[PDB]
Design a protein around this ligand. Structure first.
Ligand SMILES: Nc1c(C(=O)O)cc(O)c2c1C(=O)c1ccccc1C2=O
Ligand SMILES: [Cl-]
Length: 260
């Protein structure tokens, strides 16, 4: 499969958007990541593109170009390849060590801080959207449902993202307004829990029951593996069901588990 100067190779990532394939650029003899989307709506795609064009940070993916032809049903986004792929698969029987989780979590902090400063709410933070680059550091990927806001926070009403990572205030069935930055914090808390336990803190195959656990089930840590008390404190604060008292990113940065 040829696409101007790009030769499409095998699939390296996959999601609701479609697929991401390895692509070989014959102009510069270099590999890129090629996200392939089918027009089946389309305007959410160009919001993702508009957001990506504004982002330039070591812990965020880098959009290189967009190949859009009105005659073809497919649309192509070329990214710089983040060669080592997702930091982990969830669930897994081999979670990260605490020192490894801290290393990656420090990257996630920096990336989220940059995004929020650039007035973007990511809305789909999870380990499979955290890609490990050449130097071993994380880049945040997949802005497919991200929001841009004006002012100091987003005031939102729509429910998007990955269900196990959705914050409880986004799960009202009355279109209540909730603020955006704390949604990303919640998902960072689910992500950090996944780092060290290998599974999500709230789980159910029945979507109704999953929503109910996110909203109403108290967080429980497994007996094994035995994690540090300050890490438990940090996760507990990020998974505060009340967004008004949930820890904020400026405080996460200072948390004693993060800084030791
Ligand atoms: N989903 C994305 C995106 C995006 O949707 O924003 C951007 C990317 O650069 C990448 C990916 C990947 O899934 C991926 C999977 C395996 C190796 C590299 C990559 C990658 O580099
Ligand atoms: Cl995941």
């Amino acid at each position: 499969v040829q696409l101007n100067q790009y030769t499409l190779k095998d699939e390296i990532g996959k999601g609701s958007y479609g697929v991401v394939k390895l692509a070989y650029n014959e102009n510069d003899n270099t590999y890129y990541a090629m996200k392939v989307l089918s027009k089946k709506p389309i305007e959410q795609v160009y919001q993702e593109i508009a957001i990506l064009k504004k982002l330039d940070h070591p812990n965020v993916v880098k959009l290189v170009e967009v190949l859009d032809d009105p005659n073809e049903d497919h649309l192509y986004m070329v990214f710089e390849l983040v060669n080592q792929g997702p930091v982990m698969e969830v669930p897994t029987l081999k979670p990260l060590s605490e020192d490894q989780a801290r290393f990656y979590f420090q990257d996630l902090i920096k990336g989220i801080e940059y995004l929020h400063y650039q007035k973007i709410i990511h809305r789909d933070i999870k380990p499979s959207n955290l890609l490990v680059g050449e130097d071993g550091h994380i880049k945040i990927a997949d802005f497919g449902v991200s929001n841009e806001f004006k002012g100091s926070d987003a005031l939102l009403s729509n429910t998007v993202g990955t269900p196990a990572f959705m914050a409880p205030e986004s799960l009202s069935e009355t279109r209540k307004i909730f603020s955006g930055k704390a949604l990303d914090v919640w998902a960072m808390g689910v992500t950090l829990y996944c780092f060290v336990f290998g599974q999500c803190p709230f789980m159910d195959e029945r979507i109704m029951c999953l929503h109910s656990k996110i909203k109403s089930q108290a967080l429980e840590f497994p007996d094994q593996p035995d994690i540090a008390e300050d890490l438990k404190d940090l996760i507990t604060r990020m998974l505060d069901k009340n967004p008004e008292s949930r820890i904020v990113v400026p405080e996460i940065k200072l948390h004693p588990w993060v800084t030791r």
